[PDB]
Amino acid sequence: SNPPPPETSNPNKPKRQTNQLQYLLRVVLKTLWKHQFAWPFQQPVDAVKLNLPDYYKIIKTPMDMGTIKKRLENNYYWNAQECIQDFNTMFTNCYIYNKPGDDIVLMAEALEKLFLQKINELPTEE
Ligand SMILES: CCCNS(=O)(=O)c1ccc([C@H]2CC(=O)N(C)C2)cc1
Numbered sequence: 523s524n525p526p527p528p529e530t531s532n533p534n535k536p537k538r539q540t541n542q543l544q545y546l547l548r549v550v551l552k553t554l555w556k557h558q559f560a561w562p563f564q565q566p567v568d569a570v571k572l573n574l575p576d577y578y579k580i581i582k583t584p585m586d587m588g589t590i591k592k593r594l595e596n597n598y599y600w601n602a603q604e605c606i607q608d609f610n611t612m613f614t615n616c617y618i619y620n621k622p623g624d625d626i627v628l629m630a631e632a633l634e635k636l637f638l639q640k641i642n643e644l645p646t647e648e
Pocket residue numbers: 562563567572615616619620625626629
């Protein structure tokens with residue numbers, strides 16, 4: 523079985539709209555979402571379909587871009603750092619589970635470089 527996917531909605535959570543969060547959805551997420559290497563990261567890892575029975579034994583903090591997208595659409599993040607941390611958990615999860623040179627790792631590394639550049643270009647907090 524798969525675990526429940528991470529929380530993406532929480533009506534009682536602290537909520538605000540900021541120019542850096544708008545940028546993270548409009549620029550960072552969407553730039554990564556259209557990438558030719560995005561598809562394995564666009565939804566939670568399905569350990570049943572992929573026959574990875576050990577995945578959720580090793581990965582205890584799952585994360586993916588589908589969850590990030592929904593968290594941004596739902597204003598779930600209070601600041602850019604909370605969003606950035608989820609991206610970094612997605613990347614590191616992939617490097618922990620897999621091995622250097624694996625196709626899935628090469629894909630994550632392409633996305634990570636783009637992400638890093640987009641965070642360098644974060645607009646000034648307004
Ligand atoms: C380029 C490799 C494609 N092979 S695959 O059988 O479709 C496939 C295998 C494994 C995954 C998981 C593993 C992982 O760490 N993820 C973010 C996703 C996803 C897809």
